[PDB]
Amino acid sequence: QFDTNYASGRSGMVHLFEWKWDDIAAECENFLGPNGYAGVQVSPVNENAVKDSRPWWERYQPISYKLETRSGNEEQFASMVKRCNAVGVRTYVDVVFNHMAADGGTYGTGGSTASPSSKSYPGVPYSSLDFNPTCAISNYNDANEVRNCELVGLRDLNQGNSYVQDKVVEFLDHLIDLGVAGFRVDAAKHMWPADLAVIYGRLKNLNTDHGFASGSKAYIVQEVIDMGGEAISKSEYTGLGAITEFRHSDSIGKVFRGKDQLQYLTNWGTAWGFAASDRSLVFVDNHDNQRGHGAGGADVLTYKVPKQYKMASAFMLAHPFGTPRVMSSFSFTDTDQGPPTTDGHNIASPIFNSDNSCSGGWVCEHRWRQIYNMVAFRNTVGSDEIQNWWDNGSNQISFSRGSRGFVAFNNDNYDLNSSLQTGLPAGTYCDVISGSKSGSSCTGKTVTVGSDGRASINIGSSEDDGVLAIHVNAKL
Ligand SMILES: [Cl-]
Ligand SMILES: [Sr+2]
Ligand SMILES: [Sr+2]
């Protein structure tokens, strides 16, 4: 429940938010695999309610557990999981079993229907007996209300009923049979850990035909928003699996926006209120808070603030704490709008420019060189500890990961032009933020490390990027 089941030498779980299964399978073979990424978090794979204008959040209103969505059907999903596993990229499913669709959700994405007004969902065989008595959540200081009442009108399932446990376990086991590596448990805060323990403990072992070692169990990351001041703490879940560490997203946004100083990053980790490193999924933003949903912090950094977004992403990917998840978005100016479509309904596949960047309504942050090259950085440094920490007491910092990678940041309003200790072997390195190693040369900036380990590091405050990174797997 705690091991990611990543393949060897890989890091980074990309949330391919609202992507179709066929497009993910291609992306695994064309990009994610060859660029050392470790996994893909998919949108909910089960049938959801069809809502007017097809908002993104319609997928969090389950109608059945049949694998029929705007992303594809079961055959397309199964083929994607196989094709992704074959190139070393794992699949993690956003599973939604706190609730069923709310009132108005009559039609499902796979042809099923439902009567949420009567709590009747004939696709899951669900009836009103399978739900908690109707009430609304308002007081997050009442743990009983948070877990037993309806979240924004979504019909609240009773996971204490053995029939509901059976239906959920059957659904998750089915996904395991198809080769998934783990699950992102939606609204875990709104369910009782005792019931989740029963569901988690019943899941079968992972499918060894997809390359998982014998005895492997599903990775469990639980969506628990714990900013403090409420009745439910993330510590109620860290014994059953990992948790979504939203303090990381909030703090890293404040720090790299300039609301806090980079010099304080010297004790990044539990000293900032985070859960344990081996229990924390970290991210710069997620599909909720990039949109003002969920925690909804205005200091969250998104692709819309690109320079500081890449700096925070680079710091996350360079830092040993936690398990990083890399957001991948579609462009939006409305917090309800769904993914791009060809006709208002059919999701439009991403298209690619001459430089392999995304277009057609998709951002593909995972295809930004400053981000995927930092995945390569993370892969090169392994488990090496932070060394050679330096800062100017404000917003200029640098450090190495052992003797294998070095990173430097400038968030001050003046230039950084300093000889810094990199801890790396002497030689000529390609800055992987501004470019890549290509043959025996660099496409962007070059960094020369002398015999004493020091190098001239130059990051102008007005440059497009405010981070520089070098590592031994991009050395001339
Ligand atoms: Cl999440
Ligand atoms: Sr509940
Ligand atoms: Sr200091």
Residue numbers in the entry: 1 to 476
Copy the relevant paper text.
Drosophila melanogaster α-amylase, DMA, which belongs to the glycoside hydrolase family 13, sub family 15, has been studied from an evolutionary, biochemical, and structural point of view. Indeed, plant produced inhibitors are an important element of the plant defense response to insect predation against feeding. α-Amylases (α-1,4-glucan-4-glucanohydrolase, EC 3.2.1.1) belong to the glycoside hydrolase family 13 (GH13) as classified in the CAZy database, and catalyze the hydrolysis of starch and related α-1,4-linked glycosyl polysaccharides. As reported for other α-amylases from mammals, insect, plants, fungi, archaea and bacterial α-amylases, the enzyme consists of three distinct domains, A (residues 1 to 97 and 160 to 379), B (residues 98 to 159) and C (residues 380 to 476). In DMA, the nucleophile is Asp186, the general acid/base catalyst Glu223 and the transition state stabilizer is Asp288.
The three-dimensional structure of DMA in complex with the well-known α-glucosidase inhibitor acarbose was solved to 2.0 Å resolution. Several studies have reported transglycosylation reactions taking place within α-amylase crystals, in particular when using the pseudo-tetrasaccharide acarbose as ligand. For the DMA-acarbose complex, careful inspection of the electron density maps in the active site region revealed a well-defined heptasaccharide occupying subsites −4 to +3 resulting from a transglycosylation reaction as seen for the psychrophilic AHA and the human salivary α-amylase, HSA. As observed for other α-amylases, this insect α-amylase performs transglycosylation reactions when in the presence of the anti-diabetes pseudo-tetrasaccharide drug, acarbose, under water poor conditions. Hereby, the pseudo-tetrasaccharide which is synthesized by Actinoplanes sp. and which is composed of an acarviosin linked to maltose, is transformed to a heptasaccharide consisting of an acarviosin-glucose linked to an acarbose. In addition to this structural calcium ion, a second metal ion, which is located between the catalytic domain A and domain C, was revealed in the DMA crystal structures described herein. It is interesting to notice that the only direct coordination of this putative calcium ion to the protein is via Gln263, an amino acid residue which is only conserved in the subgroup of D. melanogaster and which is not present in other animal α-amylases.
